[PDB]
Amino acid sequence: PKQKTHRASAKRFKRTGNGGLKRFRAYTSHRFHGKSVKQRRQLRKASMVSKGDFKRIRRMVATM
Amino acid sequence: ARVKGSVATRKRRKRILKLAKGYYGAKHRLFKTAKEQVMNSYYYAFRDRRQKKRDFRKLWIARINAAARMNGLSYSKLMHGLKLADIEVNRKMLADIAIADAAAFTALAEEAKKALA
Amino acid sequence: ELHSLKAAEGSRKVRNRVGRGTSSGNGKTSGRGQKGQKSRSGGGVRPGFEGGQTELFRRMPKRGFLNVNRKEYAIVNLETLNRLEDGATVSAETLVAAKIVKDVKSGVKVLANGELTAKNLTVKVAKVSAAAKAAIEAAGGSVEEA
Amino acid sequence: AKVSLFKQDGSQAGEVTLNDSVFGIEPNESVVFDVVISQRASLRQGTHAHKNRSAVSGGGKKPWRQKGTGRARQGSTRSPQWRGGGTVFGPNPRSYAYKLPQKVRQLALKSVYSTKVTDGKLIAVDTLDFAAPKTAEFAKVISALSIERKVLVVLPNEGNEFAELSARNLENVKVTTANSASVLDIVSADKLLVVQSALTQIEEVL
RNA sequence: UCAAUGGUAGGAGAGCGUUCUUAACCGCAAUGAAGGUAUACCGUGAGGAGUGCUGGAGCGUUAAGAAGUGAGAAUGCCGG
RNA sequence: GUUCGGCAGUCAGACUGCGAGUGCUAAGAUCCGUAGUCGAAAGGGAAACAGCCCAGACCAACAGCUAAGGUCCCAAAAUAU
RNA sequence: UAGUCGAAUAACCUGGGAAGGUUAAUCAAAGAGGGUAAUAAUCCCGUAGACAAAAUAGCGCUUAUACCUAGCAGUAUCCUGAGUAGGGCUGGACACGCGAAAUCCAGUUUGAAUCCGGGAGGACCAUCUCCCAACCCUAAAUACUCCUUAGUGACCGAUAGUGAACCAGUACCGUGAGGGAAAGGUGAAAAGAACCCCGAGAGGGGAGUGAAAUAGCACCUGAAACCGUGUGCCUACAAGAAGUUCGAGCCCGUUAAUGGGUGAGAGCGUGCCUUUUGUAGAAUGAACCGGCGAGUUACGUUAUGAUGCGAGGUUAAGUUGA
């Protein structure tokens, strides 16, 4: 019928208009001992999604 | 819309078999060995569109060194005298003078004699 | 044109009869090359698949719960106020009788962007941004929010 | 403009209150054959069926077992390749309808409309609503200019009834109103008579 | 005029042929439709008609649409 | 050439040298880098030959010239100097 | 549920036969469709319309009857749906996988209040909103057709179309449950071949039949593999993917063409398919011939164009209607 949007994938992602998606950081949940002082200084924030990868967007994250 | 085009299909069959006719025995009494049998034949008819070139030229140069060798002349020094010779570097009509040309053959040979000379 | 029905460009082109013949072929192959999981029937492959490794999205943290009481106002530009002059009592009746958007999130809001062509004060709102309150309220407006 | 205003064909050579509003344009024939393809199959019933091996059958059991016993890996005679032929993907009970948006529909009427305007094979006709329904009447009124190949017949929207409960045996007569409009209406006949109420039989939506 | 034209899986473009298409356009048909058969034509190809003969009812045009639509080959199947 | 967008397939190749590794510095053996070749590229040469060498084919053609390689006969050119 | 009437035409040419071609005329609520020896509006069935049923199964309208209801202010107290709500545990359904878990329904256990009442408002405690369970019935709009016709087809033409156009669920298999085939067409009309002759008979052959007898009872049309019979050339010193190309020589004369059929001889030539790195293959596979026999659509998204209008595009479902 319709194409079912994966709601938990929507809980993974958040994309922008005329632009890419915001991807929160890896590693940032479970232990914090061995990750560095600088990695604590910088890995609260995170960067965007890839370019040549992530083209498996289609269309598993439809219209959310 | 369960349609067939049956007579059209057999007209392709008929078309290639009528164009396949002539070869040995069972082949037109069957279908598919005949299919290569025209086909291989003009594969190397395509090669013999280059190789009766390259064998009628062997007849050309061979018979002209046959008559040159009848004048005791070898093809390589004859042709060498042909590049030494005149505006004529004419080849295979000069092969065609094997009929009855002591004048054209032996005299053009003498032109080559005054070309090596 | 029923004598000589003709078609124009672009609307029509041959639907590619894929899987017959010798030229495009594609029934021998369908673009594919044999002897593989790709090379079979069904089209059976899940899209997100790191080869049995967990996926990109499968490595994501669970971020941010969602307000059930999330509610907005179907925000318009002030560029439509550049369209309509003055439309005294700029409200939802001016908005949907202007037919800008009909199904609206209950209120209305304008940007400071868009221009101060309108003259009327009594703009009936639920909530306009204070950046636009600088614009119209410094440009002959009155606040009637809700 | 001026084409007809005939009280009968041949009997009053006058104007046409078309009106000469927007009708005079480029007739977009792209849009035209779009309406011939979408207006086409608006009466395709499409009731051709489709079947399956699992639709009609007698056999859901393998008829031997393969190993050593001659032939190949094999489903059944009920598997389609036998005389018990299952269709592969075939037809289906499908519909075929679509209708265009309004502005390209009225644009499409006002394309062939315009072609009939400058063509003038439409002729403005009065009522000529007759006593009997007999078609010697309309045989000699329609043949009183005798447009030969095939003709559309613009009634009023009050529903004339005498060429209309008849003239279906008149082999070129197409009984029509303002509630008849298509391209299979008009491009079909290309040659037509008018009831001169065609302002409030044409303009009112167009 | 110059330059290009090996080409598989690959990708793009274009065209042929079959059948149904109410469409029309517009004919053929017993002096012979279709279909078959021989054929020493043409078309780059797929393909197209000419004639001879069988044969005695539907078929062809054009253009466009729609397709169970283009046949060797699978222990393919069925029938011989 | 970049960028953007569709659409692919390719995952396992050999072989020839050249430089490595392992192996009896055995191998038409493996495993690298490096070029070519085939694969997916006819024709010619080496007796046939996918891999070596030369030479990349739209087609006609009863044209010539030439690459390597050949010129006592098959089998063409030098019983050449 | 029986059916009834029901309009509108002649000749010539052709042929075995006109409705075909030709010449003319008519009709009109009927030029839908089907037959007719060959394609019909005017030949027929019919068709459009217009009539017809006692019995027949109904539908619908009018009639009093075929019977139980109302408002209304006040509130003496009663009532209003007890193992009932609930609570424990075990379940389940609810989007709800025990969860913060609502809410409902089960088993089991415990067990109220009852109009100052009680319940719901996703644990729950207050305020507010709404309702009154724990008693029963409720058409309508909906689902699907074995069926009854009225039918419609860009359904399908005898491997299709129902397994089954045919005495099909037949034959037949199997003890059984089950399975499960094959096959239609003469000719208009059998007018089906009187007779005569051969022949044990069949079958043939003459005659005659019919437009036609290659048309003769599985009969329209008749390939294809298979078997032939005749035919011009060549081959009994030859060891070929069975070929080209050239061609001695022979024979014949054509979609009239730089003709064809040959072909001695001579050069050079490893079948086709999937897979593979590479197959000529001693890697598969194919007896042959013909028929069938495989990338769709339903809905959705994306991309690309085409068209339309444009910050304005857009009607879905539905209604109307053929």
From Swiss-Prot, chain A:
Taxonomically, which superkingdom? Bacteria
Keyword Phosphoprotein assigned to the entry: answer is no
Q: Which GO terms describe its biological process?
A: translation
Keyword field: Ribonucleoprotein, Ribosomal protein
Give the Gene3D superfamilies listed for this entry. 4.10.410.60
The question of whether Ribonucleoprotein is a record keyword is answered with yes
Region spans: Disordered:
1-20
PROSITE patterns tied to this protein: RIBOSOMAL_L35
> In Gene Ontology terms, what is one molecular function of this protein?
structural constituent of ribosome
Question: Which intervals carry biased composition (Basic residues)?
Answer: 1-15
Pfam families the record matches: Ribosomal_L35p (PF01632)
Q: Give me the Gene Ontology terms describing cellular component.
A: cytosolic large ribosomal subunit
Instruction: Report the family membership.
Output: Belongs to the bacterial ribosomal protein bL35 family.
Q: Under which name does UniProt file this protein?
A: Large ribosomal subunit protein bL35
Organism equals Lactococcus lactis subsp. cremoris (strain MG1363)
Curated annotation (Swiss-Prot), chain B:
Please give the GO cellular component terms listed in this UniProt entry. Answer: ribonucleoprotein complex; ribosome
Question: GO:BP terms for this protein?
Answer: ribosomal large subunit assembly; translation
Coiled-coil region(s)? none
**Keyword ATP-binding belongs to the record:** no
Pfam families the UniProt entry points to: Ribosomal_L20 (PF00453)
- Protein family according to the UniProt entry: Belongs to the bacterial ribosomal protein bL20 family.
Looking up NCBIfam families in the UniProt record yields: rplT_bact
- What is the protein's given name? Large ribosomal subunit protein bL20
Organism per entry: Lactococcus lactis subsp. cremoris (strain MG1363)
* Name of encoding gene: rplT
UniProtKB/Swiss-Prot annotation, chain C:
Q: GO MF terms on file?
A: rRNA binding; structural constituent of ribosome
UniProt lists compositionally biased (Basic and acidic residues) regions at 1-12
Region (Disordered) residue spans: 1-56
Q: What's a GO cellular component annotated to this UniProt protein?
A: cytosolic large ribosomal subunit
Looking up InterPro entries in the UniProt record yields:
Ribosomal_uL15 (IPR030878), Ribosomal_uL15/eL18 (IPR021131), Ribosomal_uL15/eL18_sf (IPR036227), Ribosomal_uL15_bac-type (IPR005749), Ribosomal_uL15_CS (IPR001196)
Q: Where is the composition biased (Gly residues)?
A: 22-34, 41-51
Gene3D superfamilies linked to this entry: 3.100.10.10
Q: Which SUPFAM superfamilies match?
A: Ribosomal proteins L15p and L18e
A biological process from GO:
translation
UniProt entry keywords in alphabetical sequence: Ribonucleoprotein, Ribosomal protein, RNA-binding, rRNA-binding
Kindly state the subunit structure of this protein. Part of the 50S ribosomal subunit.
Q: What does this protein's UniProt record list under function?
A: Binds to the 23S rRNA.
Give the similarity note.
Belongs to the universal ribosomal protein uL15 family.
Under what name is this protein listed? Large ribosomal subunit protein uL15
Species this chain originates from: Lactococcus lactis subsp. cremoris (strain MG1363)
Q: What gene name is given for the protein in this entry?
A: rplO
Curated annotation (Swiss-Prot), chain D:
Q: Which cysteines does the record link by disulfide bonds?
A: none
Gene3D superfamilies per the UniProt record, alphabetical: 3.40.1370.10
Return the Pfam families for the record: Ribosomal_L4
Q: Does the keyword Metal-binding apply?
A: no
A biological-process GO annotation: translation
Tell me which UniProt keywords the record has, alphabetically: Ribonucleoprotein, Ribosomal protein, RNA-binding, rRNA-binding
GO molecular function, one example?
Answer: rRNA binding
Instruction: Provide one Gene Ontology cellular component.
Output: ribonucleoprotein complex
Q: SUPFAM superfamilies per the record? A: Ribosomal protein L4 (SSF52166)
- In residue numbers, the region (Disordered) covers 44-88
The answer, when asked if Ribonucleoprotein is one of the entry's keywords, is yes
The protein's assembly and partners: Part of the 50S ribosomal subunit.
Protein role: One of the primary rRNA binding proteins, this protein initially binds near the 5'-end of the 23S rRNA. It is important during the early stages of 50S assembly. It makes multiple contacts with different domains of the 23S rRNA in the assembled 50S subunit and ribosome.
The entry assigns this protein to a family as follows: Belongs to the universal ribosomal protein uL4 family.
- HAMAP family given in the database record: Ribosomal_uL4_B
Give the protein's recorded name: Large ribosomal subunit protein uL4
Gene for this protein? rplD
